């Protein structure tokens, strides 16, 4: 794990099985919002892609309000849900459960970790385990309940190490 | 009278601006606690960058907290000037009306316009009480709360209530 490691966030917005945008966010933090607010916030704000057809996605984005907070640093990915829209998620650190894993309001959730990625990666190259996973998908729901929006997340250093072989 | 109309003219604009400032603060207090929590979750020298980030978020919160009190304190004082100017006028109306019953001329200013001004002036004080009530909840963000910031809200909440107590007695 060199110092020159690219922990930048790589977002991928999906609306109903269609990739509607990609965004690299070189900041430690960002907030995913429908439309950027006029305020002096130390944290960057990343707008969702504006739906061209306008429905049913637009009705869903207009309920985000506070939106979603994502932190992409040296220790991995962290998220906090501030919106009333339900959010499920799948990531390497998801627990072993039958049903869906839902982001709780007012609780910072650890999605991805670099420590265990390096550990499980060193074990594969040597040959004592499977290769590590890194994508941290997020699924938004809307009213019956349909997964209209999907957001994938990953760090640049992760895919670069694996795709070599 | 324009001085009133223009006084309550800008009060609308400035309490709106206050409401926006309070939303800006609320949004940022979430930022801090998020970064604070992330910083607490677990060294890599990169963590210095992580701490400097949290350190810079509390300064904005502190700066904003002090800039919100400055706004609302200016409004509290302005609302006082308006109340202190409105109620003596209504007093002069009650007198001039009472005299009209024993042979005086009617008062020039209608009571319909006075009641609207006292209602619009009251609607500002209730709105401001709600906003200070929100800041008092934000003051509970952390354990020590903010002994100086919390007292500023409490001290303004008292003034707002004294202005209401004035208005609600003679209206």
Curated annotation (Swiss-Prot), chain A:
Induction: By IFN-alpha and IFN-beta. Upon stimulation the regulatory phosphorylated alpha and beta subunits assemble with the gamma subunit and translocate from the cytoplasm to the nucleus.
Annotated signal sequence range: none
Source organism, top-level taxon: Eukaryota
Localisation: Nucleus
Family as reported in the entry's similarity comment: Belongs to the IRF family.
Primary role: Transcription factor that plays an essential role in anti-viral immunity. It mediates signaling by type I IFNs (IFN-alpha and IFN-beta). Following type I IFN binding to cell surface receptors, Jak kinases (TYK2 and JAK1) are activated, leading to tyrosine phosphorylation of STAT1 and STAT2. IRF9/ISGF3G associates with the phosphorylated STAT1:STAT2 dimer to form a complex termed ISGF3 transcription factor, that enters the nucleus. ISGF3 binds to the IFN stimulated response element (ISRE) to activate the transcription of interferon stimulated genes, which drive the cell in an antiviral state.
Subunit structure comment from the entry: Interacts with STAT2 in the cytoplasm. Forms the interferon-stimulated gene factor 3 complex (ISGF3) with the heterodimer STAT1:STAT2; upon stimulation.
Name of the protein: Interferon regulatory factor 9
Organism this protein belongs to: Mus musculus (Mouse)
